[PDB]
Design a protein around this ligand. Structure first.
Ligand SMILES: O[C@@H]1[C@@H](O)[C@H](O)OC[C@H]1O
Ligand SMILES: O[C@@H]1[C@@H](O)[C@H](O)OC[C@H]1O
Ligand SMILES: O[C@@H]1[C@@H](O)[C@H](O)OC[C@H]1O
Ligand SMILES: O[C@@H]1[C@@H](O)[C@H](O)OC[C@H]1O
Ligand SMILES: O[C@@H]1[C@@H](O)[C@H](O)OC[C@H]1O
Ligand SMILES: O[C@@H]1[C@@H](O)[C@H](O)OC[C@H]1O
Lengths: 436, 436
């Protein structure tokens, strides 16, 4: 299909998944969205070391299976996460070092993979093994201290435990090619392939923020790794601010690399995010689609053959030919917008921001004074409210994030002065627009 | 004094207050801000009818006195809120009608005012007695059904009860001079003054949002009421989104009217707000000052000497004489800003938005990648994080809302290429800027 992320991704032979939290499965709003939009599931925490082996030699899959069972019942494949990692290790493992730890690591891999044998698409065998100090070397952890060959051992162990699973090395801050960490991981994967160490994929967490911003060279990074003869996957995608452009850019990078298996965003709603403060996901707390959601979907569907305007630009309604206009170039908050003959003027220059706003005059925002039909569409000081965020559908309609309603020309009017309101989307020509 | 809102307001014989919730007086973070910034207090709930007369004839002033005492002890006057109101009436009063209710209203007024006789600066004697249907008439309530003269009776009773208190009529949606409701209240007060009804002030709640946006004619409203021979007061100010320009506009509206006694914002921090989702106050939940705070303080202190930049402008470092410049006009997220000979170029044109952002290229924001000294100041997609919010202090320093740190030209460098970082504010020339 082309209406849901999963189905859209499938159109390029890829999947689109999310991270599922078992404690949220009782939330109808949560499951409704999760089941509908994704065809791949990763347990956010239920398959980690502490959750699967709370005591040494004592495995527990109750939490993991709650996620797993839900995924299969809803037709989703599953990414196992994660088998060997310095973080979230149960206390009994944090106390280990040397050979004792090495064998515990091997035992854990066997126990967890054995339970899920033949049921997992991808396994993040080893997670975050490289340093984040900026050097490019191995992270100093109890695991790394058992010997530099611990990662290799983890992978060989995993291959034997379940030959049907794709074995991935997963890490963050390895998306920017210029970063030393990225290159350190490349060198390790290269070495592995050259010596025959079992490894089928590299997972790029993709936790983008102003500290580790997404960069266009992410595509070369993916290509570079793909060339090593391994698949690549965006595993824990979230973008601080959820820029619609960045989300589409990341999506297109993956679609540009044939080895990119798919994209998993780390969570369903911003409120479910481990970093909700950065509102980095595709759905907001209300369960409504954010501006970025539409951008990702449109990208998955191939995008549009109409390059979106770069800075400023009028918004012409197909049904009237006239442009979205602010009555007499007013700058008064609460001024309802109207349809007026297009012409070079600031009160007709609208900039669609990455946050989903339709700005005018530079700091005034298309604002909805309500969520129901007939709601007055006006201009108001930009503050980021969902009643100020809009989704630009490929069918030309402009939907309000908070209301889920379309920009509608009152009474279908097409003459100058016709006011703009919100109203259930109808596909009508008085609700379709074009950028110029 | 001029480093706190209260002190800055006192310079013109005015006050800057807030609404105090007695339960929060036990929280240090709350009281630290409240006791420091305001010189006027309104009990958010402690002095309402239900809270003061749970049962007819049985008055309970415990909660009210606790707020009152805290106020006076910390150098703040008090606004009594509120004596006659259709809403939030005790269960017993709600069931009353006709003359029985009329007597109840009168008795309540005498009881509460008698208790606080001579200690209340202003009393919201009657509250929200007008309708929002557009008729400009009285809202139909049990109080109004007692007789249209109930408001007048309320005020006459109040005057006799305590001659030292200024008697105000308080309401919302009476800020926009063109609204029917506003005219309704205007005519009533005009009639009252002409007939000698004892009323000394009109309180404008000033709850501004998309539904009831702030309009510059608010000053006209205040002036008009002022011309009636009554004082005016902004009693419950909060602005959806806390627009800096709107907060500054309301402030200047009061400063422009000699009869405007002062401004009270409805809450301390956004998390204390009855409308927290609209983050409509001057302080963030973590207690940090928002861009709007600095806008209000600068306005109260008499503003700058030269009219502030009307969007789009250079930011020049005092010590260097050079401008904030994005290297090579790059638009790549993560690019660190620098100092450079000032010239006409978009990569040197910054726009300070109402949200407190410093935008460039229209949709890129001055961004801090961290909160500690040495943090890199760069450009990043605009999304609204506090790490993208800035306060333009009167001394020329620019402080990050999240970090509390100042924009700093690294090492006090003055040459082209000098990088910009965050650093503890020092009043150094490499931390002072002018927008011209
Ligand atoms: O919930 C968090 C999870 O999302 C993150 O991946 O790892 C740490 C957990 O606390
Ligand atoms: O905003 C409109 C303006 O653009 C047009 O030129 O004249 C009519 C106004 O309402
Ligand atoms: O313009 C609106 C039209 O698009 C809708 O179909 O019916 C209501 C009208 O006001
Ligand atoms: O009278 C008011 C009207 O002027 C305004 O436009 O909408 C609200 C009404 O109450
Ligand atoms: O950004 C700078 C640009 O404004 C100047 O013109 O040339 C040098 C660049 O670094
Ligand atoms: O720029 C900084 C300067 O302002 C401070 O005084 O010393 C450290 C420098 O990095």
């Amino acid at each position: 299909a082309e209406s849901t992320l999963g189905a859209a991704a499938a159109q390029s032979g890829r999947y689109f998944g999310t991270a599922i939290a078992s404690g949220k499965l009782g939330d109808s709003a949560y499951t409704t969205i999760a089941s509908r939009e994704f065809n791949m599931v990763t347990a956010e925490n239920e398959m980690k070391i502490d959750a699967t082996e709370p005591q040494r030699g004592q495995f527990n899959f109750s939490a993991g299976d709650r996620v797993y069972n839900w995924a299969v019942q809803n037709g989703k494949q599953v990414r196992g996460h994660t088998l060997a990692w310095h973080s979230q290790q149960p206390g009994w493992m944090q106390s280990l070092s040397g050979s004792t730890l090495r064998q515990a690591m091997i035992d854990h891999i066997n126990g967890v993979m054995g339970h899920y044998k033949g049921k997992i698409a991808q396994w993040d065998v080893v997670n975050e093994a490289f340093s984040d100090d900026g050097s490019g070397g191995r992270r100093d952890s109890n695991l790394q201290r058992t010997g530099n060959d611990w990662i290799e051992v983890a992978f060989r162990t995993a291959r034997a435990a379940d030959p049907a699973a794709k074995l991935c090395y997963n890490d963050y801050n390895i998306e920017n090619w210029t970063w030393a960490k990225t290159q350190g991981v490349y060198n390790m994967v290269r070495d592995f392939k050259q010596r025959g160490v079992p490894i089928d994929c590299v997972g790029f967490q993709s936790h983008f923020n102003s500290g580790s911003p997404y960069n266009s060279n992410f595509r070369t990074t993916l290509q570079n790794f793909a060339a090593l003869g391994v698949d690549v996957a965006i595993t824990e995608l979230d973008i601080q601010g959820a820029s619609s452009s960045t989300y589409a850019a990341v999506t297109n990078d993956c679609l540009a690399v044939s080895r990119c298996l798919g994209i998993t965003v780390w969570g369903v709603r911003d409120t479910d995010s481990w970093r909700s403060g950065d509102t980095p996901l595709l759905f907001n707390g209300d369960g409504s689609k954010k501006a970025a959601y539409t951008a990702v979907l449109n990208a998955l569907n191939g995008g549009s053959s109409t390059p979106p305007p770069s800075g400023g630009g009028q918004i012409k309604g197909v049904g009237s030919g006239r442009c979205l206009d602010v009555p007499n170039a007013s700058t008064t908050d609460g001024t309802q917008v109207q349809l007026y003959d297009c012409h070079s003027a600031t009160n007709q220059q609208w900039t669609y921001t990455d946050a989903g706003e339709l700005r005018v005059y530079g700091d005034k925002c298309l604002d909805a004074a309500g969520t129901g039909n007939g709601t007055k569409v006006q201009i108001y000081s930009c503050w980021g409210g969902d009643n100020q965020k809009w989704r630009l559908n490929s069918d030309g309609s402009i939907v309000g994030v908070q209301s889920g309603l379309c920009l509608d020309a009152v009474g279908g009017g097409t003459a100058n002065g016709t006011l703009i309101q919100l109203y259930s989307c109808s596909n009508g020509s008085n609700q379709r627009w074009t950028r110029t």
